[PDB]
Amino acid sequence: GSHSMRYFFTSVSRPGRGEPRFIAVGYVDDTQFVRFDSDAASQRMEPRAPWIEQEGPEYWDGETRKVKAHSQTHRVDLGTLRGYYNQSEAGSHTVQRMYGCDVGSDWRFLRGYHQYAYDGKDYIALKEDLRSWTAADMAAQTTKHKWEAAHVAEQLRAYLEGTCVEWLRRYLENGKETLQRTDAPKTHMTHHAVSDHEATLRCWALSFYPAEITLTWQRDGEDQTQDTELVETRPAGDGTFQKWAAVVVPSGQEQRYTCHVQHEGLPKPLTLRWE
């Protein structure tokens, strides 16, 4: 029953090959709903979910203008960061920003976040109280000083506690069919010999939504986490997710092993067995 709205922004410099590439996407929970791509022909914020399509021209004009303004600020940032870190003109670097809000089952504000990274590492982030900053290194302290003097946190908090929550509610209502659903995983296990003395047991979960899921193997009830290969939860492309976990076991001991599946769409966690 819990929900989130998140926007993700990536800018990558390509010195001597034009302006930095900028890509923005927005999600409600695990469902994408908007994008903008600086390299694309339209130069517009575009719909990526059916239920955002009904937003009118003021929404699309306004979101296009704001996202282009985010893109320009990251263009400035790439220059600034290269000065803060004394980096050379020619190498490619990456700025990432993510922000948004979480609400619970009752749709009231739970938490807010606004985080920045440079070259794949934490740079600066709003703390939980939305009033202060965590700066990860000395260059990010320079940004903290500038953002404190400019009262950046207060303006962000007003968004994250207010507007962000208000628009997440609206999307959850307009997209109710898509966003307020739970699709429980279809589960099974497969068994294949790898030789005459060992077998792979692979526990599968298919067609589920949302993406959060836990799959674990037990041997006589003991978790086998060091011996489990757990793949990243992956999209099926139809709005649902898949995942698997596998162990390689001595032939004959299958009945000692069980797979355990937890997902919010299940009335109870499932235990799958070889007997």
């Binding site: 926007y7 704001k66 600020t73 990251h74 940032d77 920003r97 920045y116 940004t143 507007t163």
Partner: peptide, 9 residues
């Protein structure tokens, strides 16, 4: 919807 223009670093 997005927030307003971010302040530069």
């Amino acid at each position: 919807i997005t927030d307003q223009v971010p302040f530069s670093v």
